[PDB]
Amino acid sequence: RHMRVLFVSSPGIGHLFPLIQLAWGFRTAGHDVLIAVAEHADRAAAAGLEVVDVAPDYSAVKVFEQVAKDNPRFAETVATRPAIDLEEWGVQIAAVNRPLVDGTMALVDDYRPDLVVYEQGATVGLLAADRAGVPAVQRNQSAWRTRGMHRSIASFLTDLMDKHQVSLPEPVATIESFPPSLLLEAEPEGWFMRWVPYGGGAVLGDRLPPVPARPEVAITMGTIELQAFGIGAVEPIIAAAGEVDADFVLALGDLDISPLGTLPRNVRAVGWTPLHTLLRTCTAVVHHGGGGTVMTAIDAGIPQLLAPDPRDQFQHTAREAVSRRGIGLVSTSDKVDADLLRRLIGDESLRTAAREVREEMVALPTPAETVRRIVERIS
Numbered sequence: 001r002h003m004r005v006l007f008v009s010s011p012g013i014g015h016l017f018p019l020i021q022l023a024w025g026f027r028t029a030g031h032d033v034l035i036a037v038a039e040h041a042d043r044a045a046a047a048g049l050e051v052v053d054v055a056p057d058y059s060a061v062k063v064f065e066q067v068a069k070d071n072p073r074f075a076e077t078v079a080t081r082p083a084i085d086l087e088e089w090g091v092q093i094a095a096v097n098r099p100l101v102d103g104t105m106a107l108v109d110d111y112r113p114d115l116v117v118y119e120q121g122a123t124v125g126l127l128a129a130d131r132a133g134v135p136a137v138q139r140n141q142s143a144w145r146t147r148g149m150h151r152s153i154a155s156f157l158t159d160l161m162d163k164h165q166v167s168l169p170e171p172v173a174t175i176e177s178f179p180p181s182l183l184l185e186a187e188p189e190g191w192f193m194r195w196v197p198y199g200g201g202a203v204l205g206d207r208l209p210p211v212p213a214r215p216e217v218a219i220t221m222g223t224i225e226l227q228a229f230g231i232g233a234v235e236p237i238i239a240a241a242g243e244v245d246a247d248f249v250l251a252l253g254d255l256d257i258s259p260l261g262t263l264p265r266n267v268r269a270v271g272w273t274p275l276h277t278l279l280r281t282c283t284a285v286v287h288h289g290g291g292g293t294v295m296t297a298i299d300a301g302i303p304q305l306l307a308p309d310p311r312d313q314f315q316h317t318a319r320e321a322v323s324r325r326g327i328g329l330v331s332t333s334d335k336v337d338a339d340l341l342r343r344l345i346g347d348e349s350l351r352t353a354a355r356e357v358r359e360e361m362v363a364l365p366t367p368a369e370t371v372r373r374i375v376e377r378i379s
């Protein structure tokens with residue numbers, strides 16, 4: 001009954017955080033839990049868990065650069081359109097997974113997991129499960145449909161699969177990220193699960209901060225877009241914000257915001273803060289379209305505007321749904337203006353719809369319940 005469970009994540013905070021509730025779900029159910037990730041191992045440790053860094057010195061941004069340089073045709077074609085069918089993006093996602101393989105396979109041999117839980121980007125997790133000979137459970141991201149994505153990714157890792165004597169298995173269960181209404185007409189892949197936001201711990205101070213008298217709007221762009229494309233995209237958003245009669249809080253995480261210089265007087269900045277803690281006191285949020293941020297805004301019950309850098313192809317899958325369900329607005333960073341921010345804060349139908357989608361979401365099975373379901377499925 002007592003298991004060793006290995007959680008496997010691609011080297012991204014947006015990849016890793018959606019595994020944390022399940023990892024604490026397994027730990028509080030008495031199991032041993034270990035995380036495999038690269039680049040962000042210290043953040044995983046700051047969730048109170050044990051971590052092995054399966055690729056020391058990894059840099060996602062350097063991997064991205066190497067892909068573009070090495071695949072100029074892909075870069076000038078497929079990469080000029082949104083990443084929707086990830087089968088087409090196998091070359092890029094395989095480049096991301098490749099450096100994690102050797103370290104993950106060694107870890108599987110040493111740790112001997114009974115179960116692998118991996119996030120949807122981490123084909124290396126399926127390979128790990130096959131190495132150990134154990135079931136794999138997939139945790140989905142945003143609204144991407146899996147289809148043949150793992151076969152396409154694996155087609156570029158063939159050499160490594162041969163060396164480690166592994167084939168690509170199918171997961172025994174898949175767990176959706178979004179609530180049913182935000183998948184539109186796309187067929188669900190497995191179980192729905194409530195989104196319980198995780199963004200790190202925090203000392204809030206000597207008291208619980210009160211909700212401000214004036215409405216505050218958060219501006220956040222996740223953990224990879226501005227790192228990969230530069231901080232420039234947030235400038236037109238901040239300029240538009242300075243023209244709006246509302247207060248704004250800029251939350252770009254560990255990103256150095258020095259290049260922005262002096263912010264408008266109605267815009268304040270914070271360093272890394274768990275997003276749900278920030279949003280507890282906000283009226284709306286402007287962001288890039290990251291799935292974790294979309295879901296955390298829904299947990300807060302607030303309208304959202306998705307305005308990524310126009311070059312970023314990985315923020316597309318929530319956009320149609322945010323639109324069609326009326327819980328927010330969609331644009332691009334360079335097209336944000338004061339009128340659009342006023343719509344975000346003023347259109348009551350957006351807030352009504354957000355609250356309705358939140359009600360749907362918070363009734364879904366919890367991570368604790370989902371741990372029980374997984375254990376039943378594999379027993």
Ligand SMILES: COC(=O)NC1=C2/C(=C\CSSSC)[C@](O)(C#C/C=C\C#C[C@@H]2O[C@@H]2O[C@H](C)[C@@H](NO)[C@H](O)[C@H]2O)CC1=O
Pocket residue numbers: 010011012013014015060064086092093096120121141142144222224225228289290291292312314315
């Ligand atoms: C801006 O630059 C990018 O976005 N980069 C990339 C991301 C990748 C794959 C995603 S699709 S597989 S999950 C079916 C990538 O494989 C690799 C990597 C390492 C870090 C990263 C991020 C990228 O996605 C991020 O994933 C989050 C889970 C999403 N929220 O749910 C975010 O919306 C999205 O921003 C390749 C990549 O280039």
Ligand SMILES: Cc1cn([C@H]2C[C@H](O)[C@@H](COP(=O)(O)OP(=O)(O)O)O2)c(=O)[nH]c1=O
Pocket residue numbers: 012013014015017198199200220221222223224225251252253254271272273274275276289290291292293294296
């Ligand atoms: C920048 C920032 C992000 N976050 C969280 C919100 C999300 O859970 C996660 C970002 O994931 P996500 O929004 O999926 O996008 P990306 O992969 O593009 O970064 O990081 C914080 O909690 N605090 C912060 O200061």
Ligand SMILES: [Cl-]
Pocket residue numbers: 197198199200274275276277296
């Ligand atoms: Cl959070």
